[PDB]
Design a protein around this ligand. Structure first.
Ligand SMILES: CC(=O)Nc1nnc(S(N)(=O)=O)s1
Ligand SMILES: [Zn+2]
Length: 260
């Protein structure tokens, strides 16, 4: 049992994978999030998030997929809470689509699947930029937002009118004075699921968070995109969906979460 000191055969060879805890901690395993098995963990530090200045300026398309831009020139919204060593700022996000006329999201929570979901990427500003954050595992994290269908337009009539302007991909339209808070609650507690990507052991500087209060969206909002092209006009009528991800459950004993 006693480990004789003075040697170090294992302390000799050193590689890229052997350097970072990427290979030493392989958690690459896609699985559906379960709320029933989730457990409340009040270990995190309760904090208050901001989002009063949060506002958009315009929306640019990439000829297929577009993301919403925000004015980082001010203190829009910031996230904080837990053993984190720095606050997380948000810059932009996008939404995925589905192949079915009822559902088709990336991950599935509470053994349930949604039609679409928002993808808000954030980077710890404490480390300066994502470039310095990627240098460590707990550097930069990713927030995963989900969207549920309610068929009840929360007063987005105008949002549908401006949409007729971006019928084809590759164009843009200036749109400021957005109200993303009108649908986003304070959100105190929320489940979590840290780990790495579903790709070979390379990087683990990505965390997967999930809020217990997903942003609600009407089926009428996506009913307009259904008629839109998947990449500019002139192409065969096909769905713009292209964000499918597997997650077969092996067993799932207990999942970490800040909320019960
Ligand atoms: C390098 C990289 O970011 N790749 C992906 N981007 N996000 C993707 S998604 N949300 O469409 O799955 S492809
Ligand atoms: Zn995405």
């Amino acid at each position: 049992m006693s480990h004789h000191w003075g040697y170090g055969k294992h302390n000799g060879p050193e590689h890229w994978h052997k350097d970072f805890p990427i290979a030493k901690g392989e958690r690459q395993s896609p699985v559906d999030i379960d709320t029933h098995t989730a457990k409340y963990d009040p270990s995190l530090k309760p904090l208050s998030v901001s989002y009063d200045q949060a506002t958009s300026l315009r929306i640019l398309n990439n000829g297929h997929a577009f993301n919403v831009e925000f004015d980082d020139s001010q203190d829009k919204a910031v996230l904080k809470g837990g053993p984190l060593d720095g606050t997380y700022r948000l810059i932009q996000f996008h939404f995925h689509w589905g192949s079915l006329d009822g559902q088709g999201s990336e991950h599935t929570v509470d053994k349930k699947k949604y039609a679409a979901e928002l993808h808000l990427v954030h980077w710890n500003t404490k480390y300066g930029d994502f470039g310095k954050a990627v240098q460590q595992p707990d550097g930069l994290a990713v927030l995963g937002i989900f969207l549920k269908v309610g068929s009840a337009k929360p007063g987005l009539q105008k949002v549908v009118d401006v949409l007729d302007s971006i019928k084809t991909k590759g164009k843009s339209a200036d749109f400021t004075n957005f109200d993303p808070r009108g649908l986003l609650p304070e959100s105190l507690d929320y489940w979590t699921y840290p780990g790495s990507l579903t790709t070979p052991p390379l990087l683990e500087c990505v965390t997967w968070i999930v809020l217990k209060e997903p942003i609600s969206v009407s089926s009428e909002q996506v009913l307009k995109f259904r008629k839109l092209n998947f990449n500019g006009e002139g192409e065969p009528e096909e769905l713009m969906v292209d964000n499918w991800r597997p997650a077969q459950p092996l067993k799932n004993r207990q999942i970490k979460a800040s909320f019960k």
